[PDB]
Structures are given as structure tokens and as C-alpha cells.
Amino acid sequence: LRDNIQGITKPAIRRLARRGGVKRISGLIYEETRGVLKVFLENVIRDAVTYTEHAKRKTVTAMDVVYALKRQGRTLYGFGG
């Protein structure tokens, strides 16, 4: 409901940076990464809910997420389509 942005823990962001090849991380990376992730998630979810509402459904299917990601150019393979 509230304050779920802190659920993206600092070790999770550190693991994401390690996957990205980052060796040393400053302390301000976590808040900036949370902000960027929130912006990206809002951008995708807004269009996912738009696709859901147009179809006159109450559940957000994976197909709606795939369509939204394709509409932002982030094509995803593995979840249908």
C-alpha cells in the first residue's frame, strides 16, 4: 500500500550493479536507482493498465505488459506474443 519503494533493498541494487560490471558503488546510487526504477515502472504500468482497461478487463495479463514494453521499445521474449 505505502512505502514499498524501500523494499528494493540496497543489497539488491548492489547485485544489479555487480551483474552490470560495477566494482565500487557510492552511497547515493541506491536512492537514484530507486527513483529511476519507479519512473520506469510507472511508465510501463500506466500503459499496461491502459491496455487492460481498453479490453474491459479487471486483471492485468502478461500480454498487456508485453504490449506496453513493445510500445516503449523494450521488446521482451518469453511471456507470449
Binding site: 500503459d47 491502459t50 491496455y51 482497461e53 481498453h54 479490453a55 500480454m63 504490449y67 510500445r71
Partner: protein, 92 residues
């Protein structure tokens, strides 16, 4: 015969800035803009119709396409500008 939106863009201009002209290059740019947004919205509406297994494009298809494409309040006014017109079209 070459068709464009030049007369329509000029008519829209006269009701916004009644004493402002426009050059040929700017009119061509406006025609390019109108054609680009037309094909963008029509393609999005066609995709939406295909996704829902529908064989027709209705006003809510265009409305959803406008919501998907135009950002922020630029969509929020435009939807209203669309919907009012349809209502005026409905009540002849």
C-alpha cells in the same frame, strides 16, 4: 491530384491568430506533422483492434490510442476535444 491539409491548417490558424500568416515551408512541415500523427494514431488503433480480436475501429479505439501516444495533459485535453465532437456529431 495532390491533396493536403493546407486549407485546414490555415483555417485553424485564422481562428487562433487572426492576423498571422504562414510560409510554404512551415505549411509543408504542418502537413508532415498531421500525416505523421494520423498514421501513428491509426496504427495504434489498428493494433488495439487486432489485440482484442475486433474487426472494426471505433471511437474508443482512437481514444485508447490517443491515451497511449499523447503524453500527459496533452492527451487529457485531446480526449475531451475528441469526445465533445463525437457527441456533437451524434446529436444532429
Amino acid at each position: 491530384r495532390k491533396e493536403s491539409y493546407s486549407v485546414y491548417v490555415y483555417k485553424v490558424l485564422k481562428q487562433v491568430h487572426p492576423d498571422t500568416g504562414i510560409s510554404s515551408k512551415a505549411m509543408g512541415i504542418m502537413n508532415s506533422f498531421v500525416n505523421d500523427i494520423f498514421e501513428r494514431i491509426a496504427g495504434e488503433a489498428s493494433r488495439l483492434a487486432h489485440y482484442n480480436k475486433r474487426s472494426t475501429i471505433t471511437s474508443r479505439e482512437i481514444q485508447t490510442a490517443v491515451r497511449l501516444l499523447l503524453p500527459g495533459e496533452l492527451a487529457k485535453h485531446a480526449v475531451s476535444e475528441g469526445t465533445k465532437a463525437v457527441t456533437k456529431y451524434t446529436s444532429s
